Amino acid sequence: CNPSDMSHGYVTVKPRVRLHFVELGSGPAVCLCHGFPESWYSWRYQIPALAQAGYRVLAMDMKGYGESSAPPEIEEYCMEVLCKEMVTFLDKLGLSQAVFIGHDWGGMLVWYMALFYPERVRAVASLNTPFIPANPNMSPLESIKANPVFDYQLYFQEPGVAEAELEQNLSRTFKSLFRASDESVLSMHKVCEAGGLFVNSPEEPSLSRMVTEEEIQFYVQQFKKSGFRGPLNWYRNMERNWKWACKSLGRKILIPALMVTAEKDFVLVPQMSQHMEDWIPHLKRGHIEDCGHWTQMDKPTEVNQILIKWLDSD
Amino acid sequence: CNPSDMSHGYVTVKPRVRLHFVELGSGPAVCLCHGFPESWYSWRYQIPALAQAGYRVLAMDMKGYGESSAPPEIEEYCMEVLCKEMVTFLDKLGLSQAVFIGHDWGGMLVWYMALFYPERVRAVASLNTPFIPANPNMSPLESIKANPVFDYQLYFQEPGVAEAELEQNLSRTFKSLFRASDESVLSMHKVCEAGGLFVNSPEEPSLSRMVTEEEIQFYVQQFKKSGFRGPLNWYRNMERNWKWACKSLGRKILIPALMVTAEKDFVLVPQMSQHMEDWIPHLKRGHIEDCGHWTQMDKPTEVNQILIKWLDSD
Numbered sequence A, B: 001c002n003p004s005d006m007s008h009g010y011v012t013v014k015p016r017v018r019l020h021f022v023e024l025g026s027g028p029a030v031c032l033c034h035g036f037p038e039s040w041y042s043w044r045y046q047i048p049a050l051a052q053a054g055y056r057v058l059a060m061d062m063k064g065y066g067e068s069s070a071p072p073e074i075e076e077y078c079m080e081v082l083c084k085e086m087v088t089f090l091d092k093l094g095l096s097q098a099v100f101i102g103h104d105w106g107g108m109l110v111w112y113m114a115l116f117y118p119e120r121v122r123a124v125a126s127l128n129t130p131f132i133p134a135n136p137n138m139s140p141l142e143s144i145k146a147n148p149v150f151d152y153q154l155y156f157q158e159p160g161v162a163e164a165e166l167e168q169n170l171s172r173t174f175k176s177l178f179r180a181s182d183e184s185v186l187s188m189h190k191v192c193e194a195g196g197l198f199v200n201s202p203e204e205p206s207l208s209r210m211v212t213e214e215e216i217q218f219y220v221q222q223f224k225k226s227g228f229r230g231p232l233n234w235y236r237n238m239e240r241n242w243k244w245a246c247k248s249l250g251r252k253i254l255i256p257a258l259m260v261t262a263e264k265d266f267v268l269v270p271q272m273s274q275h276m277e278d279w280i281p282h283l284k285r286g287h288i289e290d291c292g293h294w295t296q297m298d299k300p301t302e303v304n305q306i307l308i309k310w311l312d313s314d
């Protein structure tokens, strides 16, 4: 995928903040929302496929990333603020609605969009990220003690720490992260007592089967502008996000919905989604075998097929 | 229009040539192409109305203007090059077809788009500018010599001359130009003899009833970036344009088409369009009474009515 061959759009959603996106195709608007720590470019395989399938694709740089604004303040990346900005995005583009498709943190965003702004969301799809109604009893910090696979999230809390490690060597960062599950050089059991995320992983990791050197270098260039502060801030609003989700928990998602699970995502595990039909009875599903966290990159053909089928039906 | 309330798009059509556009709405793509010496902003009254009517509007800064590239070479602004660029624009955006609507020089462009690239043009509409097939006998230079109302065109030929006069005082330039026909302060009949287009006209023109100070100052700010060289270059390719037009070999335009005439446009007079049905069988027509050259600004309600009716039927 060549960026200069793409149409680049820019929408100021408030004085300090503009969102960049890439746009391809004609037809119903489909807004793609990437996760951490990614880019509009993580959708490179879906963009032309969806456009060819008859859709107008808007692939975002989410707030904090690429050519979009990345203010430093933690509170600029709470879900409530992020969602209101996506609604302003649609307004300024003159879109009454769009289909929203998200992955990872972008998947959490699209569920909140469907929940609090159903009038603006035609249909909702998430890759890897389940939708669980807020639990009125437990805080999100309490859920890390119950579920220890999210211990790296505690490491991500302290401003400056994860940033310094992830920005030290961008090429090594992206090569370490973007790998098939069987190629993985990272463990999520205890990270901050271990000293850091990369402490015991190769200084010059090999290039994963999933990615070329050229694709890795694109991410490198992108993260040179703002680095990891904005992206990491997405993790630093757990209590605010929890309190906002609580303001909804009575109401239901009534729009068409798709939950796509990845067999080998060891952080956002397929089973984390098991009882979603209890609160979304009309929920459709996709499941991808031999697929790690980096779904769109790991199994693009399978992602394309699942999304196009669902888009063309419900 | 508030420009910062708009989505701004950018497409690289050649390594060093970028086209800027404003985008609003969902539905079939409608590409608006302004004239001399104007802006995407000349479509300000049409953009929201067309979007509200169910269309996805892409209002261009044409090559040489605003935030689009403005290379200095005369040859970069021949109709053949400008048209091929607009096809590349469509390619990069992933648009198989768009409706093209032009005014003035943008009107000439959309006629050539419909003529040489009908497969990319869903339907074509021109404000003021007729389509008359190239005459293989008479040169464009000989035709300017016949009708004395195009003397300003000769004055526009030598590079540097008209630029220095139009750039001298941008505010006076736009206030002198953008006026209703009954308000006009300019000698279009004879310009080159006098030594100036504004030589006789008021040093401090009043504000036409058509425009506010705020609107005039927008054009002033746009023309600060690249000035008048690019815009004037559109006029400096008469022989090349004629040679390209002859390559059509008397082929017809077979797609849906609309010709809108303006009663009080004294440069692009309604009679200049009178025999157009002979080379465009199906041609539909609109006509606006009490309308001077600056059609979109002069009679925006009538323009909107005419265009929406035509779009919805054809």
Ligand SMILES: N#Cc1ccc(C(=O)N[C@H]2C[C@@H]2c2ccccc2)cc1
Pocket: A035, A036, A037, A104, A105, A108, A129, A152, A177, A197, A267, A293
């Ligand atoms: N709701 C929700 C939600 C969304 C996203 C994540 C998340 O953390 N994603 C993982 C892949 C990224 C990661 C982890 C560790 C190092 C580098 C990247 C956790 C919870």
Ligand SMILES: N#Cc1ccc(C(=O)N[C@H]2C[C@@H]2c2ccccc2)cc1
Pocket: B035, B036, B037, B104, B105, B108, B129, B152, B177, B267, B293
């Ligand atoms: N085909 C064709 C074609 C297109 C455009 C024109 C043209 O000249 N437009 C006029 C309005 C602009 C103008 C003229 C003089 C001073 C300032 C602006 C003439 C022929």
